[PDB]
Swiss-Prot record:
This is Bifunctional xylanase/deacetylase. Residues 1-88 form the CBM2 domain. It comes from Cellulomonas fimi. Belongs to the glycosyl hydrolase 11 (cellulase G) family. Endo-acting xylanase which displays no detectable activity against polysaccharides other than xylan. Hydrolyzes glucosidic bonds with retention of anomeric configuration.
């Protein structure tokens, strides 16, 4: 019983790539696992550090930001990724 608190909402997108915004309540304990759709990749991010660039990208603590933005390449990907934060 100690999962992280976060939610994935559509974020700022553009055309060939889109950026989603994830809000968090803890942050200091970043350990979410991003589950892309085996195709997109993190092109950039801010308000937090990421670990990986295709498959499982976990967030990391680097200051004090619970909300971080992440870009995702489409190149044929129309599904939005989501941040995981549960124990199971």
């Amino acid at each position: 019983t100690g999962s992280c608190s976060v939610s994935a909402v559509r974020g700022e997108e553009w055309a060939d790539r889109f950026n989603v915004t994830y809000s968090v309540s803890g942050s200091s304990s970043w350990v979410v696992t991003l589950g892309l759709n085996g195709g997109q990749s993190v092109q950039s991010s801010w308000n937090a550090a990421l670990t990986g660039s295709s498959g499982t990208v976990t967030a990391r603590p680097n200051g004090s930001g619970n909300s971080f933005g992440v870009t995702f390449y489409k190149n044929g990907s129309s599904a939005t990724p989501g941040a995981t934060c549960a124990t199971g």
